């Protein structure tokens, strides 16, 4: 796998509500989160 870093205090990556129900990267939601998913889908690598 790969280790990916980002900042939290920004409208790009935010902690979605009900984070206790989710776990891992699924809890983090935001514009920058969708960009990371599309790039990982195009390149083809888990992260």
């Amino acid at each position: 796998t790969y280790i990916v870093t980002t900042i939290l205090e920004d409208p790009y990556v935010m902690l979605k509500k009900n984070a206790n129900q989710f776990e891992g990267n699924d809890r983090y939601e935001g514009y920058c989160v969708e960009l990371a998913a599309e790039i990982a889908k195009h390149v083809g690598y888990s992260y």
Binding site: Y2, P11, G30, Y31, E34, L35, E38, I39, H42, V43, Y45
Partner: protein, 101 residues
């Protein structure tokens, strides 16, 4: 700025200004164009094999109109006050009725 009521003009970046205007109670607005020109970008350790295909994926997403869709969704489709009266009401030169009510 919200308390000055037309007395304090804060100078910040374009993306943060558009988000604080739309995704917040819109008592302030952005006026004028950008003074300087900057640009964001994802990084990669110096001398790594994850720079070529990553750069090609970024240009592919920006060419297929995907980044413009994601921006219009998180900045406009999810604003706090929304877009009330999206059609900008032109400044009527005629005298209103409330002025002589």
């Amino acid at each position: 700025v919200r308390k000055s009521k037309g007395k304090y003009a804060y100078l910040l970046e374009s993306t943060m200004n558009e988000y604080i205007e739309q995704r917040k109670p819109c008592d302030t607005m952005k006026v004028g164009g950008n003074l300087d020109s900057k640009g964001y970008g994802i990084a990669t350790p110096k001398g790594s094999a994850l720079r070529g295909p990553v750069n090609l994926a970024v240009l592919k997403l920006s060419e297929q109109g995907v980044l413009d869709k994601l921006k219009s969704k998180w900045w406009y489709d999810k604003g706090e006050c929304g877009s009330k009266d999206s059609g900008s009401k032109d400044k009527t030169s005629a005298l209103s009725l409330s002025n002589v009510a």
